Design a protein around this motif. Structure first.
Motif, short mmCIF file in Angstrom:
data_model
loop_
_atom_site.label_atom_id
_atom_site.label_comp_id
_atom_site.label_asym_id
_atom_site.label_seq_id
_atom_site.Cartn_x
_atom_site.Cartn_y
_atom_site.Cartn_z
N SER A 20 0.84 -1.23 0.00
CA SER A 20 0.00 0.00 0.00
C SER A 20 0.87 1.27 0.00
O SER A 20 1.57 1.60 1.08
CB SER A 20 -0.94 0.03 1.19
OG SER A 20 -1.63 1.26 1.29
N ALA A 36 -0.60 4.22 0.04
CA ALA A 36 -1.25 5.13 1.01
C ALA A 36 -0.71 4.84 2.42
O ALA A 36 -0.45 5.76 3.15
CB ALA A 36 -2.75 4.96 0.95
N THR A 51 1.39 7.63 4.62
CA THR A 51 0.91 8.08 5.95
C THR A 51 2.00 7.92 7.00
O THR A 51 2.28 8.82 7.76
CB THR A 51 -0.37 7.32 6.32
OG1 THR A 51 -1.37 7.50 5.29
CG2 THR A 51 -0.89 7.72 7.69
N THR A 101 -9.32 16.71 0.29
CA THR A 101 -9.71 15.66 -0.67
C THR A 101 -10.49 14.56 0.05
O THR A 101 -10.34 14.38 1.25
CB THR A 101 -8.53 15.04 -1.45
OG1 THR A 101 -7.79 14.22 -0.53
CG2 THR A 101 -7.69 16.11 -2.09
N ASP A 102 -11.24 13.81 -0.73
CA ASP A 102 -12.06 12.70 -0.22
C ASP A 102 -11.21 11.64 0.40
O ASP A 102 -11.80 10.80 1.12
CB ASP A 102 -12.93 12.04 -1.27
CG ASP A 102 -14.20 12.76 -1.53
OD1 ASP A 102 -14.54 13.74 -0.85
OD2 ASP A 102 -14.90 12.28 -2.50
N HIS A 103 -9.92 11.50 0.15
CA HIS A 103 -9.14 10.46 0.84
C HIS A 103 -8.90 10.81 2.31
O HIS A 103 -8.63 9.85 3.09
CB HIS A 103 -7.83 10.20 0.10
CG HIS A 103 -8.05 9.38 -1.14
ND1 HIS A 103 -8.57 9.93 -2.32
CD2 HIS A 103 -7.93 8.06 -1.38
CE1 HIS A 103 -8.73 8.96 -3.22
NE2 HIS A 103 -8.32 7.82 -2.70
N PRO A 154 -11.70 8.97 5.08
CA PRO A 154 -11.55 7.56 5.36
C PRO A 154 -10.20 7.24 6.04
O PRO A 154 -10.10 6.31 6.80
CB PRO A 154 -11.72 6.83 4.01
CG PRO A 154 -12.60 7.83 3.25
CD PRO A 154 -12.10 9.18 3.67
N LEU A 155 -9.16 8.04 5.70
CA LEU A 155 -7.83 7.90 6.36
C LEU A 155 -7.97 8.17 7.86
O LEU A 155 -7.50 7.37 8.69
CB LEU A 155 -6.82 8.82 5.72
CG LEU A 155 -5.46 8.93 6.39
CD1 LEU A 155 -4.75 7.61 6.42
CD2 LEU A 155 -4.56 9.97 5.75
#
Length: 165
Positions: free
Chosen positions: A1, A3, A7, A119-121, A124-125
């Protein structure tokens, strides 16, 4: 991943938080605030050591209203913006909404009334990390990258000017 690694690269030296408490939660909220202040001050120390000391924050006595300043460097000039936010009652499961009031009406990536539009991410993060993330993480993963797109764009568009001081 990608993402997950991205992070971790940004946040892995920020102390993790633990307590599931929001503003109404009495001794548990006082404990959550200890975690928030210890995470914030370690993030600030890390930032100073990195030549990236980019914000200050303070709260009211109960820790429910936060306000301060951020700084953004572009072509070596330093730009300062006031910032503020309230702590939602369902914090820390719900993320706070940072406002940069001087930019109200000046970026398409904002809501009416000065709240930044991430942003839309981001949502959920935040959701998948609850209750480990706190205000230091909101700054590092939310406001920081927002500024890194929007401030250069608004300087180029002639919306943001540096004051000769």
């Amino acid at each position: 991943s990608m993402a997950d690694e991205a992070t971790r690269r940004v946040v892995s030296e920020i102390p993790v938080l633990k307590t599931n408490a929001g503003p109404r939660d009495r001794e548990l909220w006082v404990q959550r605030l200890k975690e928030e202040y210890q995470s914030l001050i370690r993030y600030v120390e890390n930032n100073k050591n990195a030549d990236n000391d980019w914000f200050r924050l303070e709260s009211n006595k109960e820790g429910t209203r936060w306000f301060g300043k951020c700084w953004y460097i572009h072509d070596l000039l330093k730009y300062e913006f006031d910032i503020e936010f309230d702590i939602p009652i369902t914090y820390p499961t719900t993320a706070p909404e940072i406002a940069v009031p001087e930019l109200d009406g000046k970026s398409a990536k904002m809501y009416r009334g000065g709240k930044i539009c991430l942003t839309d991410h981001f949502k959920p993060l935040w959701a998948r990390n609850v209750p480990k993330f706190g205000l230091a993480h909101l700054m590092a993963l939310g406001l920081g990258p927002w500024l890194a797109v929007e401030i250069p764009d608004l300087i180029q568009k002639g919306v943001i000017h540096h004051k000769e001081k």
